[PDB]
Ligand SMILES: Nc1ncnc2c1ncn2[C@@H]1O[C@H](COP(=O)(O)OP(=O)(O)O)[C@@H](O)[C@H]1O
Ligand SMILES: Nc1ncnc2c1ncn2[C@@H]1O[C@H](COP(=O)(O)OP(=O)(O)O)[C@@H](O)[C@H]1O
């Protein structure tokens with residue numbers, strides 16, 4: 001797995017990220033936690049994002 | 061440990077308003093009544109079954 | 122499918138007019154004749170097979 | 183299960199169908215054959231349609 | 243339980259039949275089936291490209 | 305049998321690639337690594353791209 005260490009490093013280091021969705025929407029914040037299917041992204045509030053709707057995860 | 065289950069279980073038990081964004085950009089609003097592996101039942105004026113595969117994100121309103 | 126199946130079976134056994142929204146935003150209407158793991162058979166003018174993978178939400182109309 | 187007898191009834195009676203794709207595109211023709219993952223649709227040509235791309239199959 | 247997809251694509255590859263592959267977003271690719279596996283098709287055009295089946299709606303000979 | 309050798313050849317030889325996404329967006333850069341579900345694309349930065357969001361991968 002490449003996915004878990006990649007997200008874990010962003011989460012551990014509190015790196016601001018952009019999460020692009022498959023419909024072109026750009027979400028921004030910090031990754032707080034994740035599991036096999038979802039990622040918890042926090043900006044002003046915490047939202048649960050389904051990985052199936054995610055296209056790309058990038059440091060912002 | 062699932063993160064999805066505690067997140068949706070907290071929203072369900074809290075009975076708070078929730079915003080569900082669909083992959084096509086539509087935003088649904090209501091209370092989470094229950095959920096299983098594939099669907100969430102959202103309650104507003106009516107009770108509706110939402111397939112998780114169609115959801116991009118879930119946030120308390 | 123501890124939720125999915127009882128939700129759909131009730132709509133089917135009770136012959137409730139339903140709305141089925143697809144992930145592209147199209148809204149189909151009719152009665153659920155039957156369903157299995159993968160598809161719903163919706164009847165209005167004719168019987169049509171809807172793949173669950175293309176469905177966003179099912180609600181009584 | 184429902185797919186096989188639904189698709190086979192259409193095949194056996196050679197009834198023209200509309201296959202609507204998840205993106206709204208409408209295909210037309212007759213069901214020639216199908217398997218777990220694809221449907222062969224016969225019109226002016228024989229085209230292989232991936233079920234994962236289909237929203238609905240309707241007698242046309 | 244017998245595949246229709248595999249002999250279909252295989253025959254296309256075998257005889258170098260010109261195809262159109264339509265994507266789920268409406269984009270039309272053109273060329274020849276070069277190879278394929280469980281998850282991808284390699285389509286030979288003016289260049290060689292790997293196409294994910296999950297992104298494919300239809301494969302059309304013409 | 306086709307995907308792994310294809311992506312590894314690009315990675316190993318450091319060939320500049322275009323990754324087209326299901327929403328039409330085109331990403332460019334070098335394949336850093338990949339696993340079963342993701343490809344790490346290196347550009348100015350490292351982005352994790354979900355394969356479910358990819359339609360095509362081609363040398364640019
Ligand atoms: N990796 C990606 N996945 C999905 N959509 C993307 C990606 N990169 C850019 N986009 C989308 O393409 C559009 C144009 O991109 P760009 O001009 O770079 O805007 P942004 O500043 O939002 O990245 C935006 O809607 C953006 O969200
Ligand atoms: N639960 C849903 N899932 C997907 N799309 C929806 C849903 N509810 C409404 N829409 C879409 O959002 C758009 C706005 O809704 P509108 O036209 O006012 O009718 P409505 O009661 O049919 O939503 C409609 O075109 C409809 O297709």
Ligand SMILES: Nc1ncnc2c1ncn2[C@@H]1O[C@H](COP(=O)(O)OP(=O)(O)O)[C@@H](O)[C@H]1O
Pocket residue numbers: 147149169202206207208237238240
């Ligand atoms: N049974 C169906 N399943 C999925 N989508 C449909 C269905 N019927 C119509 N649509 C979509 O709604 C749009 C308008 O359809 P409508 O005017 O009812 O008939 P037509 O399909 O001839 O245009 C179509 O372009 C199609 O994408």
Ligand SMILES: Nc1ncnc2c1ncn2[C@@H]1O[C@H](COP(=O)(O)OP(=O)(O)O)[C@@H](O)[C@H]1O
Pocket residue numbers: 265269271324325328329330359360
């Ligand atoms: N294989 C492909 N998959 C998805 N989209 C594509 C593909 N090839 C081209 N497109 C899209 O078609 C649009 C029309 O121009 P395009 O053919 O892309 O030029 P370019 O090949 O140089 O990117 C582009 O914006 C591009 O995003």
